[PDB]
Design a protein around this ligand. Sequence first.
Ligand SMILES: O=C(O)c1ccc(-c2coc3ncc(-c4ccccc4)cc23)cc1C1CCCC1
Length: 282
Amino acid sequence: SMQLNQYTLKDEIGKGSYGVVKLAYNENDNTYYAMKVLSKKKLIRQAGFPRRPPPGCIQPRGPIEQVYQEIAILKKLDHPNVVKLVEVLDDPNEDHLYMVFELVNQGPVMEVPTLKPLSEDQARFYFQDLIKGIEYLHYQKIIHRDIKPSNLLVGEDGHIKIADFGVSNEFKGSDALLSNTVGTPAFMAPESLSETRKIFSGKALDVWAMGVTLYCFVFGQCPFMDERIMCLHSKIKSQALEFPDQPDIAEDLKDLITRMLDKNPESRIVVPEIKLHPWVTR
Ligand SMILES: O=C(O)c1ccc(-c2coc3ncc(-c4ccccc4)cc23)cc1C1CCCC1
């Protein structure tokens, strides 16, 4: 192990989009926490080398601003279905940055693909948690942009907390107006995967990813899948949603998933409607 101020840093417990997460023991309050460890120089390099001056896809001028945005976002959020940032350790003369979170004991709910999906009733309990967390994020003008089962941590109490705010965005106004976005390929909405003159809604991207997540919950694999990236993108954009013959799930759950995975973001179900869907309220 190693010492960092009042913390004893132990084994690596997870690895998200950036950095690594260690188990950390706080000697002052005799409590364990989850500590995300980052290198500022590495975060800068992850964005790519800056371009020489020339004579929708422009590199950010100051890539380090994204981690400070993630920190500001996490500081704003206090909800039982969202991770809780408790401290940031950041010396301006050091390259490392540390983010301390309350521990969510059991880790990710699922790592897709799995041969062991959840039952329909357990999927409903976790999905009810997911709705509450996302509705709160959206109310706080935050889009997560990386909703998937491996970013949903199960606590001591059997409830989920949304984690990995590495690519999250805070917007002004009613919704985020995006020209392009980031995400895990199999969870990205069809509108985000074309060359077009049309911007798209950030909140509806989170809904699409919730739809893929819910499908994963009960089936253990994504609805659109291919190892070839061009084929995966083509399927997300043009392949009709299908459900496997087994496990046989309820018709109302198929209705809900179908509405969340509507390829048209204008007609895709919204979170206020998802909350009142018959499968959710049963
Ligand atoms: O990469 C980040 O941005 C990030 C930041 C904080 C936590 C975290 C906070 O509280 C936690 N309690 C528990 C765990 C955990 C425990 C066991 C196994 C895996 C994760 C992770 C966290 C987790 C992450 C990601 C790394 C894999 C999951 C998502």
